[PDB]
Design a protein around this ligand. Structure first.
Ligand SMILES: [Zn+2]
Ligand SMILES: [Zn+2]
Ligand SMILES: [Zn+2]
Lengths: 175, 175, 175
């Protein structure tokens, strides 16, 4: 497994035996990993400037890129869903938020909790997004606030993905 | 090597010995692969929900991601060109169609045959695209219909990729 | 090490061992590599049609894809910064230019020197971008010219990535 140390710092796991990590996944340097977090195929977390902090119950899907610039730590609240091929750079993400596949969130951006950032959306540098927002577009705009039911599908997402992580540790075999 | 089985299902080949599969390309679970289909570097097809069915002569270029949600099997017609780094999620795509590099096709979307989806395009959920269409933008727009010359350059494209695929099984060696 | 030769052609390094190459990076066929150029995790350069020329002191970040169609060589000026997950296809890029993360540059495009192409930008086929330009959007628009302070941050960026590359050769170890 490509878990790498850089400049003396290595990924620290709150509970490593609970983390799903695909063979393709790469965690490097200052990465802080919560409980039940899963990192799927081709993901890259380069914790070489500011540290990258992954909350618990958080899924990081295929080929997500996370990185930082000095002055911009990257923090993800708990039970978040990071869609296939998202890019997160030097931003902070509230708990129970979904980042749609292929979406890009840039330095200094602040996404609230219980948010849905739609697929392909670009959240520009320093953009701030209120809790419970549904965000789509390029440029990104707040469409409306999410109902309490939508906010539940977010928690549901995090839970299914934790379980799915577990099942891959147990039930994925070469063929 | 990275062909994986998950929960009893493994990738099924109509004629394996004809399929180009780059060494880091990753096939997982319920994946049905036609003949002469080629899968290039870093691609990932995760068939852990609904099955992923890849028609014959279809090329899946670099770091393409394919996945499904329950209720949305992913089916790709034959002789298709899946551009570098596309994302296909739970959708259906007609034969002789080109999906441009960096494009995103979401759940329930239905793309006809003989279509050109331009690079960076986002085809939203459940969107239907008539046959012979040219589609560009984010959000996607049907721009016009293709002349017979375009539709044939699509056919050329799949034909050229099959040749290049086979050539890679033979003429790719380490330096 | 996935450095590959194809059809008799091999990657040529002006000064190998000055080049940072992540274990995940993939170089194929007609690729010409400058000095101090760095290739990070998951990158792919497929030079099987026209040749791919990487200017010196130029960084190629995570999972960048570079490719060509016949008639469209891909050439990168010196000291360029190619952002996370960019796609470059058969284009030419001036020295000291930044191609933002997730940006797409298509065949025959010509990007000037000292340019800043923002994240998520789509530079369509044959688009020409004057020197010292700031470019953002999809479709891309030329916004204004950069002041000398901005142009300096471009030079600075390329310089840090050279050091950081070398530092990864020394200070990256498993676990
Ligand atoms: Zn970065
Ligand atoms: Zn998915
Ligand atoms: Zn190509």
């Amino acid at each position: 497994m490509p878990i790498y140390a850089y400049n003396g710092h290595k990924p620290q796991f709150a509970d490593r035996e609970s983390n799903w990590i695909a063979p393709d996944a790469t965690l490097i340097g200052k990465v802080v990993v919560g409980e039940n977090a899963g990192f799927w195929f081709g993901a890259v977390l380069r914790g070489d400037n500011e540290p990258i902090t992954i909350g618990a119950d958080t899924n990081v899907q295929e080929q997500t890129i996370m990185h930082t610039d000095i002055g911009f730590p990257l923090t993800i609240g708990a039970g978040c869903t990071i869609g296939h091929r998202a890019i997160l750079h030097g931003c902070t993400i509230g708990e129970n938020t979904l980042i749609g596949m292929g979406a890009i969130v840039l330095n200094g951006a602040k996404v609230g909790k219980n948010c849905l950032i739609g697929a392909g959306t670009l959240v520009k540098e320093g953009m701030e997004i209120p809790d419970n927002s549904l965000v789509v577009g390029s440029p990104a705009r707040v469409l409306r606030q999410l109902d309490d039911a939508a906010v539940e599908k977010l928690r549901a997402s995090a839970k299914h993905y934790v379980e799915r992580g577990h099942s891959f540790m147990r039930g994925m075999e070469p063929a």
